Amino acid sequence: AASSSNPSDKLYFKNKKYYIFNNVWGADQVSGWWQTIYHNSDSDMGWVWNWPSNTSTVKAYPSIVSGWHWTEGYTAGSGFPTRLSDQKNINTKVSYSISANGTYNAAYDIWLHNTNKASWDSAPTDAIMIWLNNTNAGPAGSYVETVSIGGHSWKVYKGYIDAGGGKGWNVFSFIRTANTQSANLNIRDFTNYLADSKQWLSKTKYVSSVEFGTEVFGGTGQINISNWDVTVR
Amino acid sequence: AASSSNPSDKLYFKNKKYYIFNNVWGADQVSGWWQTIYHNSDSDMGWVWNWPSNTSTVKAYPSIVSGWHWTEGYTAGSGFPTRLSDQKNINTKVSYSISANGTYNAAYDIWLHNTNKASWDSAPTDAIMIWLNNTNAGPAGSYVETVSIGGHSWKVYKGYIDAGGGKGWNVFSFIRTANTQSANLNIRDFTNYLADSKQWLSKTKYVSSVEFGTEVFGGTGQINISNWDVTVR
Amino acid sequence: AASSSNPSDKLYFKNKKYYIFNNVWGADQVSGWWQTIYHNSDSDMGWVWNWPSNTSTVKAYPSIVSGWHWTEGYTAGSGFPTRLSDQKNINTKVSYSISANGTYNAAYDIWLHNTNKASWDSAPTDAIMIWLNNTNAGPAGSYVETVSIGGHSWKVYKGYIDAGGGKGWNVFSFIRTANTQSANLNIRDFTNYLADSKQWLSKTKYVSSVEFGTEVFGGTGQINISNWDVTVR
Amino acid sequence: AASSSNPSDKLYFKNKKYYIFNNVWGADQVSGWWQTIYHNSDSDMGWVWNWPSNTSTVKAYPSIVSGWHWTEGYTAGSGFPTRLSDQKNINTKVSYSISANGTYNAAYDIWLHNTNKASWDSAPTDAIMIWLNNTNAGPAGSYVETVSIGGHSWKVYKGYIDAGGGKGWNVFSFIRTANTQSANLNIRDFTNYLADSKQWLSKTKYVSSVEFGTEVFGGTGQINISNWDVTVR
Amino acid sequence: AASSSNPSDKLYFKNKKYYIFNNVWGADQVSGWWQTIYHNSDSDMGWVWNWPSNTSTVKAYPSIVSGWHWTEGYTAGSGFPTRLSDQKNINTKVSYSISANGTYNAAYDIWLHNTNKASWDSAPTDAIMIWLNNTNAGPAGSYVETVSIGGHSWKVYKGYIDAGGGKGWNVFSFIRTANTQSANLNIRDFTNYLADSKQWLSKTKYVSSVEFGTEVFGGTGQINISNWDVTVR
Amino acid sequence: AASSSNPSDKLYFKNKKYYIFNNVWGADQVSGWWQTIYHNSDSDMGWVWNWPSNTSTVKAYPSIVSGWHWTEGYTAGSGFPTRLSDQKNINTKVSYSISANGTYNAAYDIWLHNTNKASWDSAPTDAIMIWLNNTNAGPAGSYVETVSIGGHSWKVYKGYIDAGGGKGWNVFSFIRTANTQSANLNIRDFTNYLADSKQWLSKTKYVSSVEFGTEVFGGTGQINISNWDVTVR
């Protein structure tokens, strides 16, 4: 077992296919905070946080990463990158529980690029978010419609994140109409909706990453994850 | 942004008109505790605490200070001291939220003296408290009556705090009949009630300070303040 | 007052008749945790914890000890060891409150031996547990029946803890049918039930210890104890 | 074993004849600091500190206390108070080691009063300090002379500490001419010098306390004490 | 007094002309570290650190900033920006002491731009460093010569820092031939050497910032600063 | 990078061939301590500690493990267990630096068993220690002689560690006659000396583990390791 607390710390697991990532990307202008990632086993892991702030900015996204995350390449054995036109199933399973106050979510974050050689400075072209928990928060962009995908109902949002210099990505968010602590999803169901139903995503693009974590806007609490996997088949 | 954790630490803001004060005045005989003050912006600030104790003594009053607080003088630009007979409006606005357990309040603490040159050892003559939150607590002194002042209903209490050696002050507490997270008050409405309606306060006295904070008796939690000002007009 | 945080720390009180014990016996394979014991007075003491884990193993039993606990002997003035056949009253009083999440209990743990000279390596023969709080947990062994003892109703369980090498003890657990924050019990009522009603305990055995604490499986929180004593009469 | 870190925490030992005291009396106007007292056994105890400051004010005096220290009375079995005219031996033994930077001392602090019923607000009449270590520091008052007492050479200083309101005490400091890590002293040798040789102390006064600790002006480090006792015979 | 420990925290002082800055720019790929900035007064301030690493990368530059530092503008009253062709004196005074192990320096860092409206994304054109302490370190670029400027001898180095995308700055480092704890310097003496003696700097450029801090490569320790000012005249 | 601080935490590296181990085996009866293990890269790793105690007991052995350590089996790819009669080279390389006070060593710890299926409760038969640093410490057992092995001179000691119940192991310690920060050793040179020159070790035994770490008796400091490997060929 191990537990780490500095910015951008990584706890690898499953033969380095995944890592828990102490991602504090939104923290520069706030203080008073702490965030610790931990791994006891592959079925007992999570993170603990304290983000004292009332603002609507994301302070942090402690998370599990499979694939790329502004890294030189992709985690070993992850199955990323995978081109959408290859039509692989991207099967994910998670079971978790949160005890927290304030404003946060629990969400998948899926990154796409045009390149199959994403590196440390490769800006994504698109992000897909799948929120299993929304606690007092709301997504980027504008509400489109409610859809049934994968046996769940989702409110769909579409926006654009400007990352400076012409860098920036579409963001497509799927917010479950009620919170859930477990899901078994195929990311391909969501990318097929965006590509074939909405004509918002080209199948020439590559899925670079599947991440799962909690965006924290403010408050204190923790998550524990009791089941996790992402497999590209 | 900044966040500090030692006893009596001060985080100044608004051109040093105010400071957040890590006031732990009641802590000498307890242990196991911590208290951190933070300022991200003038609309995003607060404090976090842990006071493990069951007793009815106030352990701490983390707070924002305007004016005097056992200091050589008064914060710059605060407008203190102001003599009650000058009849200035003392307009205060606060919006806040607490997430905590145990026993605590959220309260204004207004200090008065006979002297307009209050220094580090000048014992006040009177304290006025205005409680916007009461969580399992109760004030000093005895219940007088319920009054409507400033558009709110308040239970009024009157007591006396003995500070040793003949030092000591009246304490007049106004406890809102239900908790609220925001208020816009004129302290003059409260001092006029005490002076003109109850004949308990001379208008020869000076208001030395307006403070807002949480008296903590026991438990753990935090406050965040999203709006704050005190202006003497 | 004092507050300590390392494994197996001890805070003695009442002329060393008792100690608060930072017992982390189940912690070897987990990380991310902390646990602090504190004593402000003999009527204001407790402990604070954070045990991030989903598993059904006991991580820790922060507790007050009277008597023996894998020590060379017994706390001074505790009245232990006492032979069951001497039929002494073992009167205990506790009042407490917990604020926590996760999975935990509040329980007496009473140790028995054949020897009246229990030492640091003397494996007990039996444990009796009396749970005043059960929060999402459950005991060792199998359910027997519900009984009224001492004015309370208890679900009774019987199991066996294997401690290796032939070492191991019976465990008899009494789980109150609803949680309570205070109790006045005579341990002799429980040992008489086990010995005379169930024929599960010989009165040749000695009571070595009476402990009270919280077994924590996972989560974060604290206890405060406002009344405590154990007296052998 | 135990280790505590809040202001004014106390770790009692030797049947409460002594306590280690987390004395931070000079800390109000500084920040960034920490101080922890610990006791593993009566021959393995000490404290650890960090006092980031360049100033000549004493920030803290972590110490062992026997007798009184602004308390209602005197530690049990200490032998205090003892009237100087009763001519008791006050035998002290200490062995210690410091590893630190900055500015500090290791010093006995002996308090005297006119009253044999010193209470929590009883201002002393005199202090005697016996410095076994001086690291970049210097005492209150003015240099008198160098004397041989008890087999050691001491630079003697005489000053007066003003504690406000007419409260205040003489301070007589004996600074060893070279540092030492161990000493066996009889306080009566020092009070006899002050009374009979210098005519600076009346034998009507009572010794209220013998304390040993490190005054820290700035820096970080620790002390460990391997032998300690004070006995009035 | 105050003391803060999160990345990029700021403690302003001197009417916000300066701030102490918890600058951890090189920390992304290391762990196990901490860094705290503190201010007791304008003559008693500093920082404490622990950077466990053997590598030659700068992990952090805790520092005092006057002027710009990837901010929207310049600190109030700093006197920045100032165009070199205006030939203002830029007088700096510092007195400090370090107690540390490992590899570090104590150095001024002076930033220049072509623009007098430097903003949060304005890459500098040049950096000038003035090292008062070198402990096991060495500068960027190549050694030029040893020069006497301002009454001190300096080893002069010239390099170029590539900041990506065409962004990047010359770096001119002046390393005192022996360490010193205090200096009174005029930055204009150094910019005149670079411009008029070496023809390496155009006087069309603006000085945007004067900073003083410790680049830490590895190790633990602290600095205390007892005198500080930067004035543009 | 990662850094962990709880007892028995593990940071695996090199495809789980090794782990850094937060081994605090001697800590039960002391307090005031902390110990953190960290890994930035395979050439930048180490640990930081604070063990306030004067006693001659080993408090902790933060270390890198290859092979077994009271585990069910041996680290993957370590090459353990290896039977001495197979005469494999066991080549080790380390380069490190310590900055610390107090009493400690830097030492290899090599464990042997009769069994090639060592499990979590398999008591070793022998330990071999190779001390590259001795700071105020001394080994178990009695001095034999000084020998030249592998190009270094070593003081050789022989003792026996009683682990209870008949469990216990020979301990053979080789203490370099002067400290060194780097070594390239073949463990077979040391086991051949013990077996063939001294007739103290049977070649039927298996090497189960090669560990390198710092036994800490007391004090505070850190190690950094810049090169590490153990290979069985």
Ligand SMILES: OC[C@H]1O[C@@H](O[C@H]2[C@H](O)[C@@H](O)[C@H](O[C@H]3[C@H](O)[C@@H](O)[C@H](O[C@H]4[C@H](O)[C@@H](O)[C@H](O)O[C@@H]4CO)O[C@@H]3CO[C@H]3OC[C@@H](O)[C@H](O)[C@H]3O)O[C@@H]2CO[C@H]2OC[C@@H](O)[C@H](O)[C@H]2O)[C@H](O)[C@@H](O)[C@@H]1O
């Ligand atoms: O160039 C220097 C080093 O760069 C490091 O990479 C950093 C990138 O430079 C950052 O852009 C990047 O930030 C992203 C962050 O990691 C994501 O988790 C976050 O995800 C958002 C997503 O954008 C959003 O659309 C969706 O709805 O929600 C998710 C989950 O929260 O996106 C961040 C992108 O930020 C850009 O766009 C938004 C603007 O507000 C922002 O200013 C833009 O930057 O982060 C990486 C990693 O480092 C940082 O994040 C983790 C922190 O712990 C760390 O402290 C940060 O530095 C490379 O890894 C290094 O190699 C380079 O040296």
Ligand SMILES: OC[C@H]1O[C@@H](O[C@H]2[C@H](O)[C@@H](O)[C@H](O[C@H]3[C@H](O)[C@@H](O)[C@H](O[C@H]4[C@H](O)[C@@H](O)[C@H](O)O[C@@H]4CO)O[C@@H]3CO[C@H]3OC[C@@H](O)[C@H](O)[C@H]3O)O[C@@H]2CO[C@H]2OC[C@@H](O)[C@H](O)[C@H]2O)[C@H](O)[C@@H](O)[C@@H]1O
């Ligand atoms: O003389 C040495 C240094 O004194 C410092 O001033 C301290 C005073 O000496 C204390 O009396 C004072 O305590 C008061 C505290 O700051 C207030 O917040 C508190 O407010 C109460 C109020 O009285 C009560 O009536 C109302 O209902 O609730 C409010 C909010 O909680 O009142 C305290 C007064 O205490 C006296 O009366 C009650 C008795 O129980 C008590 O024993 C009496 O003392 O505090 C100041 C500031 O320092 C202390 O408080 C803040 C802590 O963080 C710090 O550790 C404490 O020292 C000067 O500032 C220094 O310059 C002097 O050197």
Ligand SMILES: OC[C@H]1O[C@@H](O[C@H]2[C@H](O)[C@@H](O)[C@H](O[C@H]3[C@H](O)[C@@H](O)[C@H](O[C@H]4[C@H](O)[C@@H](O)[C@H](O)O[C@@H]4CO)O[C@@H]3CO[C@H]3OC[C@@H](O)[C@H](O)[C@H]3O)O[C@@H]2CO[C@H]2OC[C@@H](O)[C@H](O)[C@H]2O)[C@H](O)[C@@H](O)[C@@H]1O
């Ligand atoms: O031999 C080396 C040192 O031993 C120390 O004694 C330890 C014993 O060796 C451990 O067996 C013992 O663990 C017990 C623990 O302290 C109890 O609180 C716990 O109580 C359980 C009870 O068994 C259970 O039946 C009931 O329902 O719930 C209670 C309350 O939680 O029982 C533990 C017994 O563990 C054994 O059986 C179960 C197996 O899972 C386990 O592996 C077995 O060991 O603990 C003592 C004290 O030290 C340890 O516990 C406290 C921690 O803080 C510390 O870190 C641990 O070492 C001696 O005290 C030393 O003198 C010896 O040198």
Ligand SMILES: OC[C@H]1O[C@@H](O[C@H]2[C@H](O)[C@@H](O)[C@H](O[C@H]3[C@H](O)[C@@H](O)[C@H](O[C@H]4[C@H](O)[C@@H](O)[C@H](O)O[C@@H]4CO)O[C@@H]3CO[C@H]3OC[C@@H](O)[C@H](O)[C@H]3O)O[C@@H]2CO[C@H]2OC[C@@H](O)[C@H](O)[C@H]2O)[C@H](O)[C@@H](O)[C@@H]1O
């Ligand atoms: O009235 C409220 C509570 O008071 C508490 O008692 C405090 C006294 O009020 C303080 O005066 C006292 O401070 C003294 C300190 O404890 C001593 O260790 C120190 O010793 C000096 C000595 O004077 C000096 O002459 C010699 O050379 O060096 C020694 C060792 O360092 O003296 C302090 C006296 O301070 C007065 O005089 C000097 C002035 O600068 C100063 O302002 C004056 O006050 O301390 C006690 C104990 O509490 C405080 O100290 C320990 C801290 O941890 C704690 O945070 C502080 O409050 C009672 O104990 C309570 O019951 C009362 O409610």
Ligand SMILES: OC[C@H]1O[C@@H](O[C@H]2[C@H](O)[C@@H](O)[C@H](O[C@H]3[C@H](O)[C@@H](O)[C@H](O[C@H]4[C@H](O)[C@@H](O)[C@H](O)O[C@@H]4CO)O[C@@H]3CO[C@H]3OC[C@@H](O)[C@H](O)[C@H]3O)O[C@@H]2CO[C@H]2OC[C@@H](O)[C@H](O)[C@H]2O)[C@H](O)[C@@H](O)[C@@H]1O
């Ligand atoms: O765009 C997102 C946010 O950017 C923030 O500004 C950051 C810049 O983006 C970084 O380039 C900048 O890093 C510099 C750092 O602050 C300086 O102190 C350092 O100074 C060096 C100097 O270059 C060197 O030449 C000299 O010899 O030594 C000094 C003292 O150490 O230079 C850093 C420049 O880094 C670039 O070039 C070198 C490359 O290795 C590197 O990758 C390049 O980036 O830092 C600012 C401030 O934030 C960061 O630094 C402080 C940290 O605490 C913090 O965590 C970091 O983010 C804006 O302030 C935000 O508004 C933007 O949203």
Ligand SMILES: OC[C@H]1O[C@@H](O[C@H]2[C@H](O)[C@@H](O)[C@H](O[C@H]3[C@H](O)[C@@H](O)[C@H](O[C@H]4[C@H](O)[C@@H](O)[C@H](O)O[C@@H]4CO)O[C@@H]3CO[C@H]3OC[C@@H](O)[C@H](O)[C@H]3O)O[C@@H]2CO[C@H]2OC[C@@H](O)[C@H](O)[C@H]2O)[C@H](O)[C@@H](O)[C@@H]1O
């Ligand atoms: O049975 C319950 C759990 O046991 C765990 O294994 C522990 C063993 O039970 C302990 O005996 C073992 O302690 C040894 C320690 O890990 C070694 O590093 C140490 O090495 C010494 C060596 O003996 C000495 O001869 C040489 O000169 O120096 C080295 C380096 O310091 O030896 C310890 C052996 O201790 C025994 O003999 C000496 C007696 O004083 C002592 O009382 C005896 O016990 O440790 C393991 C691992 O856990 C413990 O150590 C690491 C700590 O972080 C942790 O907190 C401790 O529990 C199993 O791993 C679990 O699966 C079992 O459930």
Ligand SMILES: O[C@@H]1[C@@H](O)[C@H](O[C@H]2[C@H](O)[C@@H](O)[C@H](O)O[C@@H]2CO[C@H]2OC[C@@H](O)[C@H](O)[C@H]2O)O[C@H](CO[C@H]2OC[C@@H](O)[C@H](O)[C@H]2O)[C@H]1O
């Ligand atoms: O998934 C994140 C998403 O939740 C966040 O939504 C923002 C949205 O972009 C913005 O337009 C709107 O003003 O605020 C949203 C967050 O606020 C909501 O949740 C928090 C509650 O406290 C609020 O009350 C509620 O309204 O957008 C970020 C991406 O942010 C980046 O792009 C947009 C910029 O405004 C930010 O500065 C960037 O960091 C998603 O990651």
Ligand SMILES: O[C@@H]1[C@@H](O)[C@H](O[C@H]2[C@H](O)[C@@H](O)[C@H](O)O[C@@H]2CO[C@H]2OC[C@@H](O)[C@H](O)[C@H]2O)O[C@H](CO[C@H]2OC[C@@H](O)[C@H](O)[C@H]2O)[C@H]1O
């Ligand atoms: O505003 C504070 C006020 O709440 C506090 O009230 C005391 C009151 O003075 C006392 O008479 C009574 O016994 O206890 C009150 C606090 O208890 C209540 O709130 C906490 C809950 O746990 C309790 O159950 C509930 O009854 O008084 C302090 C001032 O205290 C000082 O003067 C009175 C002395 O008794 C104290 O020792 C002094 O510190 C207000 O600041």
Ligand SMILES: O[C@@H]1[C@@H](O)[C@H](O[C@H]2[C@H](O)[C@@H](O)[C@H](O)O[C@@H]2CO[C@H]2OC[C@@H](O)[C@H](O)[C@H]2O)O[C@H](CO[C@H]2OC[C@@H](O)[C@H](O)[C@H]2O)[C@H]1O
């Ligand atoms: O008092 C402790 C008791 O609560 C614990 O019960 C175990 C029981 O022994 C085991 O058979 C069963 O599988 O799990 C019980 C705990 O789980 C329950 O509470 C926690 C919730 O999260 C679960 O959902 C709920 O089912 O037993 C320990 C003693 O444990 C030791 O003996 C049994 C072994 O399995 C352990 O490894 C030993 O440590 C009591 O102290």
Ligand SMILES: O[C@@H]1[C@@H](O)[C@H](O[C@H]2[C@H](O)[C@@H](O)[C@H](O)O[C@@H]2CO[C@H]2OC[C@@H](O)[C@H](O)[C@H]2O)O[C@H](CO[C@H]2OC[C@@H](O)[C@H](O)[C@H]2O)[C@H]1O
């Ligand atoms: O034992 C303490 C004693 O060391 C301290 O000495 C002061 C002395 O009272 C003062 O006159 C002089 O200016 O400074 C002395 C301390 O400075 C010396 O040691 C620290 C080094 O950094 C300096 O360079 C060196 O000169 O006095 C205190 C008592 O202080 C109280 O009375 C005097 C007042 O000035 C203080 O404010 C009071 O707190 C002894 O406890």
Ligand SMILES: O[C@@H]1[C@@H](O)[C@H](O[C@H]2[C@H](O)[C@@H](O)[C@H](O)O[C@@H]2CO[C@H]2OC[C@@H](O)[C@H](O)[C@H]2O)O[C@H](CO[C@H]2OC[C@@H](O)[C@H](O)[C@H]2O)[C@H]1O
């Ligand atoms: O002031 C910093 C300066 O000291 C640092 O010098 C580097 C130099 O740029 C590089 O060429 C050389 O390899 O290492 C120097 C540091 O090493 C020396 O000091 C540390 C000791 O441990 C070493 O033994 C000793 O040789 O350069 C940075 C700027 O760094 C940036 O540009 C150069 C890139 O290599 C870095 O990645 C960048 O961050 C100055 O801020």
Ligand SMILES: O[C@@H]1[C@@H](O)[C@H](O[C@H]2[C@H](O)[C@@H](O)[C@H](O)O[C@@H]2CO[C@H]2OC[C@@H](O)[C@H](O)[C@H]2O)O[C@H](CO[C@H]2OC[C@@H](O)[C@H](O)[C@H]2O)[C@H]1O
């Ligand atoms: O490698 C460890 C070894 O250094 C330690 O040596 C002990 C030796 O066993 C004991 O006979 C002697 O009294 O003390 C040695 C340590 O003391 C020396 O180093 C520390 C300095 O402070 C001292 O001044 C100096 O003399 O032995 C342990 C193993 O210890 C176990 O067996 C022996 C028992 O006495 C212990 O209780 C056991 O833990 C080696 O791991």
